[PDB]
Amino acid sequence: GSQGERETWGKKVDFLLSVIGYAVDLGNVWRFPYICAQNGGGAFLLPYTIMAIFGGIPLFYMELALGQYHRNGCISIWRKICPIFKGIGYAICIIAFYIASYYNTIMAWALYYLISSFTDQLPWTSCKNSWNTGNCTNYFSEDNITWTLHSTSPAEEFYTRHVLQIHRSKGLQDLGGISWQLALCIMLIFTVIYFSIWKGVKTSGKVVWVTATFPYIALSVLLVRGATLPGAWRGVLFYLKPNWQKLLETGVWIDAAAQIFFSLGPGFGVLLAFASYNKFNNNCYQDALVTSVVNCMTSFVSGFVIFTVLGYMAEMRNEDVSEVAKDAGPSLLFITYAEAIANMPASTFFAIIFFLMLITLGLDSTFAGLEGVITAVLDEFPHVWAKRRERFVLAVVITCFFGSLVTLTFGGAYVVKLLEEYATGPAVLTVALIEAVAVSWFYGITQFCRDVKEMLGFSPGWFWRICWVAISPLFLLFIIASFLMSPPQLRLFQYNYPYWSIILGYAIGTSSFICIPTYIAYRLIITPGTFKERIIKSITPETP
């Protein structure tokens, strides 16, 4: 009685475009074109697909199948699979928090640009502003200029001294105080996700119609726009020129694996939640297949969208697009790409749809990000919770604002990197490995093939079987070992992070991980019996 059976989605296309909305984000736009053109160019497509087929797709489809089959949250599903690994559901809840502290501040920057892009003369065109230094040298100014080590462009000056105000902080040590503009921007973001999540899957699923389709439109406008620019073939040459020798490096495969994993994002509980609210009779194999193939191809065309404008920018400057595309991160889109689109007709248009496109890219993904955690807590503490959804949703949203207050600082950008590199990647890889191993090895991949066989009507192929049993946990294990062995020294804006950052990072990387061995200790520590007896009753799910 009472609630009993769970709710169901409003249409097939909503959940298709919804999982597509989670899959597609900023990184699809600029991360993949950079990592592609840097690691052997077009040849990077060869391992990228392999790491997709053997790694990303199986985790994606396994996660999705479990989600639609068991209809449980990220915490409650472990109660009915492997209770000792229930802490996994908790770990994600912490991980997501760390992500929601920086991912939306980027959307706040794109939002600050968007509202600052309504003026007839764009701010980052002239140097006669209140934030530019004496180094600021700009165009529509005398030709022959010969750039100096200390000179700075109006776009770099605008991004550095205004929207970030990063010159007012010395690094991780001193980063305060808070830029209230980005606080209001990210507040508006938390509002626009508040009215798109608070109701549940119906609103996220309806806002997704806009948040997942518009990026293709803006990418299409900047695509046909960037294609008509003179000398844009340079960026395409640098973008797709095959350099097969780079394929001999054992690093490149690692980069491809990490890319496809962190662009499909399986085992994060978001796909579990998005899959939970669907029909048991409804097919999901085709769903997972098509959805991934969209995320990959969308990245492929996004490469052109970026490197066409970068090619035109390298033509107006002096070629070897790599030099104009050295820095990967927020500067490739907020400085180089913005300064590139500044010299184009009706620049207000392309600017508005560009930064609006950035916000539109982050919105759907963060919808899904929150959706997974919300589903997990509501399903884990029912009746004690579900009293209202706006209460718990409001709680997690304002929590994400207070979490971003460290990021809204002057040196917030610094923290963004520290959180983007150190915290998420190793832990997420770990929980994906433990999750995959627990579904494929503990629960038994045989019974999983029986669950899919009861789901779609047919048992999954021997390919999916061997991928889940061996190829996928080895796929995650690869990136785990390669990551731990060579953690990266990182620098941003002529500032090398202190030696101790990794320590801090490891804290932020493990402070979220402590819950699973301590929960195994809590489960095995709480029920008396013998060690062999209690772990045998704790590995087998509920019989009824």
Place this chain on the structure above:
Amino acid sequence: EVQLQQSGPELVKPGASVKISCKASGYTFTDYYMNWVKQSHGKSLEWIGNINPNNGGTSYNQKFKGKATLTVDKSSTTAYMELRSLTSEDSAVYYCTRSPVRPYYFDYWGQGTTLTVSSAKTTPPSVYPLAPGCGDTTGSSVTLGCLVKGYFPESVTVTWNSGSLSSSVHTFPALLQSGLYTMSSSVTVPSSTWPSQTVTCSVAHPASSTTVDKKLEP
């Protein structure tokens, strides 16, 4: 104005190391990239690498990675290049040249640094006055010379009367044989100041730090 004063020539035995300086002056030193170009005898220019004087930002060439090490000092505005594992190919002239960041041209260069990598002993030059005979017919102009014989390496300077005058001085290149060089110098000066006044050739060998001056006598 803008001056890049490099260091003198260096004679070093193969397998050792050698450091070359580059005193920059006449501009804001922190405003420009400091580059190093290699020039082999009879070869083209070869870009070794650059350095950012602010933080020592060395950007090398894959062909010179581990072969050259660029350093910089702001306290004296001087850039250095150190070379290890010296062979016969490194026996070339090296320049340090200033460059902006974009466009990347080399506006101002140094005078060059002659590096000789050989185990041959530094041999002092033999200065012998090449004077015309006493039976020649003195016309409107007399041609004189001075012979520099047997020295190593090629670091040598033949001057004429403290450089006054030298509007008709033909200096012949040095030739290498059995590990020792040999060159000759000539000067065409009118007969109305000889042998009345004093004409003297000065031979200086910087590698051996010697300077022998010989006056021409008929």
Place this chain on the structure above:
Amino acid sequence: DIVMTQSHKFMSTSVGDRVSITCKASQDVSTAVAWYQQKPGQSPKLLIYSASYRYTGVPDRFTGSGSGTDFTFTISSVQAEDLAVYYCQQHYSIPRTFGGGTKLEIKRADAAPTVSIFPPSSEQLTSGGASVVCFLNNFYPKDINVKWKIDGSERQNGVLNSWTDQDSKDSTYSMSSTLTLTKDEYERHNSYTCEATHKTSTSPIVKSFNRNEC
């Protein structure tokens, strides 16, 4: 990397003629080529940057052109001091590469080689050596024969020819033919004679001196 190819290692021109040096790059460069002028014995001097723009302090007689891969350096009024070796260099892709180098040799009218023979000095006779010198100054072109005569016989062992580079004032080559001998052999012969065969005249110029205290 980028390979800058200057197919013509040498180019002959005259004072006042229109000269143009070519430069071939590996790939498309847009307008990112700089031309340098290295005078014999000097550091390379920057003349052109970004294909066509001239650098400050460069006379109006130096121009640049080209857009894409092939670029051209033009001199309208060649002067005697414009005698140098010109290099081309790309400035877009890391690393920055240079051209092979084009030596610009100046062509003028023929000049008679002034031959002067020199007896071994007393300081060298004192050391125990004796070198008879034969200077050949101000002639054109470079091609010239030098024949030695100790006592009328063509001496060929111990003869070294040293050609200097072209001149920057009158564009005239100059060479030295050196005949190095021992003191014992020097005090057993007297009148030394060196002769030169040039294209200015069919009869070689013959110079002679005597050992007996001149």
